[PDB]
Design a protein around this ligand. Sequence first.
Ligand SMILES: Nc1nc2c(ncn2[C@@H]2O[C@H](COP(=O)(O)OP(=O)(O)OP(=O)(O)O)[C@@H](O)[C@H]2O)c(=O)[nH]1
Ligand SMILES: Nc1nc2c(ncn2[C@@H]2O[C@H](COP(=O)(O)OP(=O)(O)OP(=O)(O)O)[C@@H](O)[C@H]2O)c(=O)[nH]1
Ligand SMILES: Nc1nc2c(ncn2[C@@H]2O[C@H](COP(=O)(O)OP(=O)(O)O)[C@@H](O)[C@H]2O)c(=O)[nH]1
Ligand SMILES: Nc1nc2c(ncn2[C@@H]2O[C@H](COP(=O)(O)OP(=O)(O)O)[C@@H](O)[C@H]2O)c(=O)[nH]1
Ligand SMILES: [Mg+2]
Ligand SMILES: [Mg+2]
Lengths: 430, 430, 431, 431
Amino acid sequence: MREIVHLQAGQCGNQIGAKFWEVISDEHGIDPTGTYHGDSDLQLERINVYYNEATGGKYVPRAVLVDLEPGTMDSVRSGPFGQIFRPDNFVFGQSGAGNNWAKGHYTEGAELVDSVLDVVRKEAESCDCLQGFQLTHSLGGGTGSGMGTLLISKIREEYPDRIMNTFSVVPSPKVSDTVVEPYNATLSVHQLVENTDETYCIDNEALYDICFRTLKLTTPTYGDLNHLVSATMSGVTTCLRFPGQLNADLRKLAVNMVPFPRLHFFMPGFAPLTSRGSQQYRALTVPELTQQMFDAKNMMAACDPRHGRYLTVAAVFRGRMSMKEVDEQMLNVQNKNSSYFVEWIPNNVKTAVCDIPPRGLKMSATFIGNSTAIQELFKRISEQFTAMFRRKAFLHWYTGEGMDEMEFTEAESNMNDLVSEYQQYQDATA
Amino acid sequence: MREIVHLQAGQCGNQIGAKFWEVISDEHGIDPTGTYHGDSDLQLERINVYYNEATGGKYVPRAVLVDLEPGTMDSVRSGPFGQIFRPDNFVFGQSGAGNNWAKGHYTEGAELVDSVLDVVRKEAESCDCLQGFQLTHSLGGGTGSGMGTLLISKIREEYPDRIMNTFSVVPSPKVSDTVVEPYNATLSVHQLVENTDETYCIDNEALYDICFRTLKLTTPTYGDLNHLVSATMSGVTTCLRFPGQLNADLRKLAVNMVPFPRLHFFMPGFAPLTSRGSQQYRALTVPELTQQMFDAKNMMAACDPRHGRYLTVAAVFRGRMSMKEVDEQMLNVQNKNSSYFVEWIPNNVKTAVCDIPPRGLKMSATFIGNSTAIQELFKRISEQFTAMFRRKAFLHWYTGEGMDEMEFTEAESNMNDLVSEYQQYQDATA
Amino acid sequence: MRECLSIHIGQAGVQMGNACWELYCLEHGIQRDGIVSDSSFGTFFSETGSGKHVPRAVFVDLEQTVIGEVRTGPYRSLFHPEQLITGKEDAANNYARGHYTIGKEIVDTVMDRVRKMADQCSGLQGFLIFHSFGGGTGSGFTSLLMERLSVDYGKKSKLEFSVYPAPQISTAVVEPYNSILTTHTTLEHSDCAFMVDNEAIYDICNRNLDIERPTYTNLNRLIGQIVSSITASLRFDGALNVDLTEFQTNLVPYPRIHFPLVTYSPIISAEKAYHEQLSVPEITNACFEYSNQMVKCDPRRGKYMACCLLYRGDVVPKDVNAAIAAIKTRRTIQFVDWCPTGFKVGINYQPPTVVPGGDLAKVQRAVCMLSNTTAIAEAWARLDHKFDLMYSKRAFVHWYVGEGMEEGEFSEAREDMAALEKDYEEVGTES
Amino acid sequence: MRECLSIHIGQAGVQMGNACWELYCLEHGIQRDGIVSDSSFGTFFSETGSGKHVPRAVFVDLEQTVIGEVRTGPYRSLFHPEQLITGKEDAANNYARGHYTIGKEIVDTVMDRVRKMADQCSGLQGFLIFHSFGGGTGSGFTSLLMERLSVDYGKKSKLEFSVYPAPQISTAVVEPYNSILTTHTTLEHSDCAFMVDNEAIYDICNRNLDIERPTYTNLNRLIGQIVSSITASLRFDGALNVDLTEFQTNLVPYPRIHFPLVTYSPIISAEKAYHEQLSVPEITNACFEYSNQMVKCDPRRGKYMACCLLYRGDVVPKDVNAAIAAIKTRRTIQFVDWCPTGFKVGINYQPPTVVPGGDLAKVQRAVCMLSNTTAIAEAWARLDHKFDLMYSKRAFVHWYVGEGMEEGEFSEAREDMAALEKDYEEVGTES
Ligand SMILES: Nc1nc2c(ncn2[C@@H]2O[C@H](COP(=O)(O)OP(=O)(O)OP(=O)(O)O)[C@@H](O)[C@H]2O)c(=O)[nH]1
Ligand SMILES: Nc1nc2c(ncn2[C@@H]2O[C@H](COP(=O)(O)OP(=O)(O)OP(=O)(O)O)[C@@H](O)[C@H]2O)c(=O)[nH]1
Ligand SMILES: Nc1nc2c(ncn2[C@@H]2O[C@H](COP(=O)(O)OP(=O)(O)O)[C@@H](O)[C@H]2O)c(=O)[nH]1
Ligand SMILES: Nc1nc2c(ncn2[C@@H]2O[C@H](COP(=O)(O)OP(=O)(O)O)[C@@H](O)[C@H]2O)c(=O)[nH]1
Ligand SMILES: [Mg+2]
Ligand SMILES: [Mg+2]
């Protein structure tokens, strides 16, 4: 069967993974101890996708949890679903990265890179037909950006044919969490822009907005944001886990979504998102879901899609569906928003439908869009990068870890090319 | 099915709407929670006209409630029928208009105009065949006159083909509620005179008179006046909601009623209106209703119709009826009141009959008249306008919001043309 | 409708404030200890996350005596201690001291509190300012705050309640200097001012009320009802709500004419209440009589330019229109020609509350009138006459000059005041 | 996240240490006798295989008086006797004595303990150093330890908390010599220093707190909360954990500019707490006001280069972003151009604890700010001015020279200090 191995690096990656496996395990009816207590036989039909079956019906997820400091991973052990992961997969270091890409990529993480590969290889061999790898991390952090890219380069060299998805949290436009994010992001993107096949850019600012207005949640915590990220993460892999009328695995999404190899940065979305107050007043039908997913107010990226054009779009539905409604609504969006798609691609929507809905919902959809508006995100990071690097604001920390200043300009130049390439295709033949 | 979306702006509009939806929901047998508990199957036949059906039989009216200050809308939430409207349609601002047209049209309301259009567009898309929009507001207020006209201009630019009715409360001749009404009314009319297809002028002075003598109500509150306004509002749209022998939708009324595009200001009326003391002593027959509707004592506008002539008249009956009686009585009014109709229109009455009567009544009728006497109303407002603007009585408040004095004279000149046009057609060919 | 901020400056303003806030607490049911033994008391109060409500006010004075009473009074727990700003030495009835020398030292402390108060407001309708037109702190420091507030909060409503010097009664010798100087510095910045005279209210207490021994606890308590009527629309629901900014839009035709006078009806003792119906016409007709207005200037001597009847209680809109219609047809009552429409009606459902131990009777129906009448020009003229009568000989100019003020300021103040008198003349005549 | 080692040197540092360790024990629940009547107290404590926890600290002083109090104090059982290193004769406020003559004798004993403490750590984040910038032992001996630690533990975090001389208050005559000399010897070795002034904290105790009789038991107790906020991430779990090394990576753009100032909010008395909501914006806005920072230098006089808001308690991440967003849009608050991103957010779940008998109220929500602002250059300049004003006439150089120090060292110290002032000028200007 098709199989995936999950990698989570850093505080952001590990905490997202913890919520992600809570959602995945709940759908397949897995007890926190690892036992199976589901009701439908269709859950075990593809449980091999994520879980290795151990003796006694104890299903063990094949996830590799990496963090240069024990702190974050220690809480995962004591969490509600801590006792499901294999103890040996917790590859934790001691000296945590100081939020600098250099330390997590060259000095400290380089010592732990070999240990992680040992765990991953065992998982890859445990599979019968491995499809691809998944990485959850943040581009603004040290370990995630550093260790994540170091892992990506190494595994790519060892699994060139397979796929690797990257659910990466991206720095927010207005409010930042770390001072030196521009250096980490620019360097990290320089690695992802050539080593990963698809990326799912997410930013906390957009997720905060969704909770504030789209969900009317007064006190949102990371226990809430990570659920939306997990929900989108589960949607992308639903076809692998469950049957449907029109399926789409990870490879199918990548081929349709990526026109050119370097333009593989996407922006996800989810529907339906309704507050309990407004739940009663809204009808749950395909037409309603289509409007929300294409609404700029629901995108999980700060960049407003209306400021640019769509190269490719993918909507993965779940639950009982009507194919005619799906096609009609996609036809409406294609025509109504005439100028939001590049003409040189006659049709931009790749659809997929799964029979099983998520959790208690009777219907859901996950949105993926390869908009050119994301060029704005890279534009801002480069502007911030040049603002600091112009006079070496924080460069002595990176140079002291073995990095050379020539690398920063190479990353800057490579990043500038990506924006130029994006701008080129925003033009039209006529 | 034919569908309408309701807009209510300001304290006057919102409070009229609240009573309006109580009447509409009661006729269709809708529980205050939104559930349907009616007895006749004919109520749901056209419930799509006003209500969007949600899951569980909970019908949600597609009304947009706009007010620049939360105050008035807050009471609507706590009202008897507060829990029927969709929460997201309550587009309320914070800084309420200071009873000046400028603030509600240029500075404050202009910031909230975009938000309102988002709600309206969703409603318009929810319809299968949208007919037109309805606006309830007051011409003497700030938000209603300001925001209402700003909405009208915007939606007209976006829905030129469709219809837009405006049930506008007009300043009373003798007693006013606001000092600066003349400025707001003149500016507001300058927008309505070219952007709306039909208007239903109402004044509190006439409604107070109806309660005092025609209904013998000792203590009339706005809980009473808004019912008469709602009753007329329901009558105009009865044919859409229910069948009849001779139907007349909103478009049919406008085409018959409006000879010339700028003369689209009407004066409504209702029958039967009888006090409980006099209810026993009066017979309820078509001949009795016809006399009252054409009685100047029952008009909902201060202007006395006998001071002018009728260009077009429309009487929409409801309940079990006899077509012969309707035609005979209309023939009597046509001949008896020979000089009350302009000759250059051979016949001025457009009739319509609906099978279902309103509330517990077995028979009712709604009167609409495009009299030239309404020129008197515009004449008074212009006289008051020139009295103040002659020396800039309160002009610094309007000029401080971005308005230019040239706009006031343009509105004054445009208003003066309307009176001149009305006077022209009051003449006869011979 | 959201917060309106109240600033109480000077002994007069503060003593009025405690009367006003005592009234506010009773209406909303907040005990004297700040505990709330529902959704509309947020305009003047902030919920301290614990069931304790703090008034949204800043009490400022240059002498600890008046604010010391509040700190030791029954409402000590109610107010935020940092809000009760107090100085060291009083202004000594000197405008120059309250503005330049001692005022400049404490102005920053006040603005620091106001900014913090303003930040915690989703919406800020405007500021209420309680002060005495005649006096050192109440007239010199308020001018500073008006100038400071204007730059920071341009185009936000700044209402003020001012104790205008009584035409006949006076409690200080240099009031004409203090009153004219403050008028000059607040005319451009203030939006509108509600004027009340101590002599006028004294007359009401004797004739309308049966109190033969009135005190400032009576004037301030009665004056508190005026503010309650003005802000009831914000704090309560009812037909024809009148927001705070509607006053400046309706009652101020010209920027420099923003001094409406105060009137309140009914004002009757408990015993005299039994013999009166107190219907809408009965209370309404009282507001337009000279015997009830709270400024001793005779309204009949001039013409009206705007009025706002803030009805309250068990009142019917039809009766309001009928009563107003009767007023407009009176020949004795005159409205200026260039304002065909003068009335700004406002109706509220919450009846006035009864303050225990008060001299006012329980009325289920009350009306408050704010009117902008040219007759108030007869009050400015007496102030102008009382000014040059002293300034010609330099009666007290040395005290003001020594406090960092220039003699030329006196000349400018009267010149600006002189134009204001001319303005009322211009608006009061029509072809 | 593993051990961070605390070295308390001098009377100031030691007296701060006992306040800090009293705070640490209460947070983790360790009794005053070292018994633990769960997995996170290992950063600052070592389990003595018997249920008794020994603090991971080295208390060093050249006079037995201060450490003698600890040996006889309530926490006598807590500390390892060998850790409490004490000398024979004090440094007599002389930098040369504390560094060359008497410092050299006891330096080896300290390093012997530090090495043994370090060996029992699976991971060693870095060292905390508590000392007084002005003084003999607290400034002369710390320079020795910084030099000794650097050679042995290169590239390991060396945090220090320094009592910078107050601009106006001073308790010794030769502080300018002592303070400048130590700055020269710690600039190259130290990673970053958290600066606090006694005068600044005195002002807070009077204005924010209502304590009219503060003592060093109050300053040190308040200063202890600063360290607790900084190290809470190591000792507790929460969203956006901030390790020890993230400070040097974020708050130090250039190697020589590593002197962030301290700020803490809320700081309110028990009585004044009842009248305040203390929401996230309320506490956050206080950190950026001049009235609350713990260094008397005015932040508004300069520009920020980095900030780390160490939120703590029942706090919501969304409110943190909103509050921070509001700060960045202020025109008065200025951030240097070459640093588009200045904030380093950090959130922790464990609320601050209440020290019995303390002057601070129980708050379920607190924030601590570390900011690197160019305004601190106004503090170095006064120190520089106070130095050459004495060195020109050789005010006290004979005492320093006689203790095995050369006069040329004085010239080098100021020259290095002069460049540091120039550096802040260079970073504070952009095209
Ligand atoms: N209605 C009323 N007027 C008052 C009250 N207290 C003082 N006044 C008036 O204030 C006038 C004098 O100015 P004050 O307000 O007393 O003085 P101040 O505001 O404290 O300013 P200073 O000169 O510094 O004392 C007197 O003529 C009084 O009429 C009061 O409690 N009620
Ligand atoms: N905040 C605070 N500062 C202190 C405390 N004790 C001493 N100081 C400061 O220390 C400065 C003088 O240096 P000290 O630390 O007292 O002297 P020392 O470190 O023992 O070095 P010696 O010169 O050898 O005594 C004074 O100006 C005080 O401000 C304290 O308990 N709390
Ligand atoms: N969506 C989300 N983002 C997080 C979470 N925790 C941390 N982050 C982000 O992670 C970034 C910090 O980088 P981090 O991963 O903690 O550093 P690292 O441990 O070295 O990889 C911050 O900008 C946060 O926005 C979480 O639970 N959810
Ligand atoms: N018929 C009727 N008229 C009303 C009602 N409420 C207010 N009005 C009228 O509204 C006018 C005031 O304008 P208003 O709409 O309140 O100001 P706005 O909130 O800025 O739009 C007054 O002249 C009243 O006559 C009501 O319930 N019924
Ligand atoms: Mg005084
Ligand atoms: Mg000592």
